[PDB]
Amino acid sequence: MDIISVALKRHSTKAFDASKKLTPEQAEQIKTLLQYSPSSTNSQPWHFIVASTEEGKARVAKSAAGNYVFNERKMLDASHVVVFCAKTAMDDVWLKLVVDQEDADGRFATPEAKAANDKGRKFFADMHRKDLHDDAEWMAKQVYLNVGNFLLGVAALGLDAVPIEGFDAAILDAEFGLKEKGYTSLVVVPVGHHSVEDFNATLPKSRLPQNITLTEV
Amino acid sequence: MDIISVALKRHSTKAFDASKKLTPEQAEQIKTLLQYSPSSTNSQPWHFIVASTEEGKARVAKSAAGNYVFNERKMLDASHVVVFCAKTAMDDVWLKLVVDQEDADGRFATPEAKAANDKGRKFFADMHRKDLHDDAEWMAKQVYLNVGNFLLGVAALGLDAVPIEGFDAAILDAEFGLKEKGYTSLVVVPVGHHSVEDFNATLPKSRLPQNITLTEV
Ligand SMILES: Cc1cc2nc3c(=O)[nH]c(=O)nc-3n(C[C@H](O)[C@H](O)[C@H](O)COP(=O)(O)O)c2cc1C
Numbered sequence A, B: 001m002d003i004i005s006v007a008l009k010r011h012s013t014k015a016f017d018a019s020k021k022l023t024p025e026q027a028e029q030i031k032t033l034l035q036y037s038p039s040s041t042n043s044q045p046w047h048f049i050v051a052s053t054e055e056g057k058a059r060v061a062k063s064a065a066g067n068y069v070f071n072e073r074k075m076l077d078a079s080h081v082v083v084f085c086a087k088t089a090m091d092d093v094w095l096k097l098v099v100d101q102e103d104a105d106g107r108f109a110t111p112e113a114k115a116a117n118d119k120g121r122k123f124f125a126d127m128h129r130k131d132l133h134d135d136a137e138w139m140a141k142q143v144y145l146n147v148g149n150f151l152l153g154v155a156a157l158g159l160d161a162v163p164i165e166g167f168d169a170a171i172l173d174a175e176f177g178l179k180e181k182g183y184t185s186l187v188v189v190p191v192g193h194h195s196v197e198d199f200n201a202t203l204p205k206s207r208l209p210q211n212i213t214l215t216e217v
C-alpha cells in the first residue's frame, strides 16, 4: 500500500491456513520475484525449489524431522514452500551462461562491451574464488539478498510467509539430490495465508531504536 | 501498479543527479525501512551509516579508491548514501538488548514466555557461535537480507539505488572507527534519482530462464 505500511504490518507467520491456496496468478508472480531479484554482477548464484504438492511439501518437511519438529506444520499447511539454494562453487561455465544470457537479451551494442562485462565479472569472481577463498560464502549472501527481496515482495502481494533457518540442510540436500548438482539449501520460506492459531499476527512489532543502530553524517 | 511492476522496472542506477535530493519525508522513510527489516531470531546484527552531507559522502567516497575508483561518482552524486554494516561477533549483551526490547514492546505475556524466547535465541546463537564457528558469516547473511528488503523498498518509493560491493572495506571501516565498535562495512547503497546519463535505465533487464534456476514439485 504504502510500502512502509506493508513493511510495518508484515510479520513472520506461525500458523498457516491449509485451506487457503494461492491463485495460479499469485503462484506465477511469486516465481517472478524469485527470478528478477538483483545480485552482484548479476551472477544469480541460485536455485529454487517451489513445492506445491503435498508429497513435495512432505519431502521438504523431511528436513525438520530431527529436533526441528515445531517447524513441520509450517512447511505442510502453507500453499507453496520455497527453498532457496546457493551454488557451492563459482565456475566458468556459470559465468559464461550469464553474459551469454545478457547478450541474448540485448544489453551490449558491440562485442567489446560484452568482453568488458565478462572481464568485469571475472574480476569479482576471481577475487572470491582465487584470492580470498570465500566464493561459496559470497554466493550464499546473494541468496539472502533474494530472500529479503522476496519476503517484502510477498507481503506486498497480500500473502503471509515466514523465513526458516531451523531445518537440516544435510537431509534436505540429500532428499533432492542437490549439490551433486552443485547446490546447498539455505532458507526455507513457506508462503500462504495465516490462520487464527498465529498469535504473532496480533502481537506488536519489535525493533531496536534508531539511536542504537543508525549513525548520520 | 503492484510490486511485480516495481521489480520489473527497477534497475542498478549507474549515474545520479546531484540536484535531485530526497524529500524530508523520504529520508525518514528509508530509515524506517532499514530498521524494520526481518532477521533470524530478530537478532538484528547490524549498524548503518546514512551519509547525506557533502562532508559525510566524501568520507565514504574514500573507500572508492585504487581498483574501485569507478564507483566514486555514484557515492558523491547520490542524495543519501547508506553503508550496511554487520557485527563482528555475537556478544551476550546484544542478545540481552534484543530480548529486553521485545519485552518493553509488550511481546511477552509472562516472564516465563520472555525467558523461552531468550533460550530460543541463545540456541541459534551458540549454534553458529560455539558449534559451527561461523557467526560472523551468519550475521552478514542477515545484513544481505536487509539489502534485498531495502532495494525493493526504495524502488517502491520511487527512488533509484545501486548495491555496491566494489569498495575497500578496510578504508571505510578505519575512516569511521567501526572496527573498535565491533562492526564491518559490507555493502554500500547510494540512493537518489538517476540522471539522463544513466544508460542502465534504458537497457533491457536480463535474468536466466526459470527452466534452469527453478524446480517445481
Ligand atoms: C533468515 C531468517 C530465519 C528465520 N527462521 C525462523 C525459524 O526457523 N522459525 C521461526 O518461527 N521464525 C523464524 N524467523 C522469523 C524471525 O524471528 C523474525 O523475522 C523476527 O522475529 C522479527 O519478526 P517479524 O519477521 O515479524 O518482523 C526467521 C527470520 C529470518 C530472517
Ligand SMILES: Cc1cc2nc3c(=O)[nH]c(=O)nc-3n(C[C@H](O)[C@H](O)[C@H](O)COP(=O)(O)O)c2cc1C
Residues within 6 Å of the ligand: A037, A038, A039, A040, A041, A042, A145, B010, B011, B012, B013, B014, B071, B162, B163, B164, B165, B166, B187, B200, B205
Ligand atoms: C550485492 C550487489 C553488489 C553489486 N555491486 C555493484 C557494483 O559494485 N557496481 C555496480 O555498478 N553494480 C553493482 N551491482 C548491480 C548488479 O550488477 C545488478 O544487480 C545486476 O546487473 C542486475 O541488474 P539490475 O539490478 O538493474 O536488475 C551489485 C548488485 C548486488 C546485488
